[PDB]
Design an enzyme around this catalytic site. Structure first.
Site: not given
Lengths: 201, 201
Positions: A89, A151, A180
């Site tokens: 990430d 994300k 996400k």
């Protein structure tokens, strides 16, 4: 259904000790969560704890401000992978994006993706600091640069995932890119709402 | 008796744009401050703006959580110096310190100092997350590792510099190591209190 595989068991607070990480790992195996998310400094430990476990080791690059150079984010990615990370990430260069320096944002994400190899890359866009145009542009840049997920949040800023934001990202990247929802308290109600808004696995 | 030389003109918010950084640089030369403190992504830009001035380019390593590996902090240090940084503020590995893993803390700070070369290194200990023993030990480790400054805070946690903290740090490292007060909201009055408590420049 099977909400347990929508859960990335996350602990990223700076004061976090080894005991707390080990507790998180134990809970992650016991409740069979999708992954654990730790800062790079714990990756090795996590890798050793979850080697015999469907649970993946997830870590964070250029976190949480995303104001590092692309070379350094790439290096941190390759280091994290050498230490045993399964997922990556990264935090987008928010400042560059707000500046309008899209070339540098793109270079940044591409730098991280290039170093990733077979591992998946999620780009945290930090939606709470963005206009809607900037969210859209962040997602487009993330997709062009070859990221696998967008994300919502780091959980270290003013706000987390919103239904509107999630829906907007899903609209932007299409159905074949991951979206996400991160940030927030976060109750299962939130998770249901985000999934209905278009959030994925 | 002249306070402008105790001021490190700082802008590190993630949403920070180029225009805001340039404004900070302009103000820094125009009022003759000690330095500008920016995230690595702006170092080059700062280096070009302040190449003809007494004002130093300062950047932040492993910031603000300090939960990166020593290799990555070292690499980021080398990258920042290659980009034109004059000083290096690193964040101590707070989690390791709270764990009692002093070997790793020391290795970390030493890695950054090694990558530092002739440039000065400040170790941000993030005092607000620490017990007094941990503050003392963070300062001791910073000193042993050959750092030049200990700093109170990142400005991204629950609290910044307190007079007591500064006094404790000064008491711990002696008179020949730098003690810098940084963090949250800071009127010149606070700066007076911290200097009287033992803070340097």
């Amino acid at each position: 259904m099977k909400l347990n595989k929508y859960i990335d068991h996350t602990i990223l607070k700076p004061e976090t000790t080894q005991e707390q990480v080990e507790k998180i790992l134990a809970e992650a195996k016991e409740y069979d969560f999708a992954s654990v998310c730790v800062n790079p400094t714990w990756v090795a430990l996590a890798a050793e704890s979850l080697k015999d476990s469907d649970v993946k080791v997830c870590t964070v690059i250029g976190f949480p401000l995303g104001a590092n150079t692309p070379a350094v984010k790439a290096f941190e990615t390759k280091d994290a992978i050498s230490n045993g990370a399964d997922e990556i990430d990264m935090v987008i260069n928010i400042g560059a994006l707000k500046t309008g320096n899209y070339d540098l944002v793109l270079e940044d994400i591409k730098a991280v993706v290039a170093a990733s190899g077979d591992k998946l890359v999620k780009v945290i866009i930090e939606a709470c600091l963005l206009t809607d145009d900037e969210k859209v542009k962040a997602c487009q840049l993330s997709q062009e640069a070859g990221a696998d997920y967008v994300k919502t949040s780091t959980g270290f800023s003013t706000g987390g995932a919103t239904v509107a934001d999630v829906a907007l990202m899903r609209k932007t990247v299409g159905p074949d890119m991951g979206v996400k929802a991160s940030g927030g308290a976060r109750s299962y109600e939130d998770a249901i709402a985000f999934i209905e808004a278009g959030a994925s696995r």
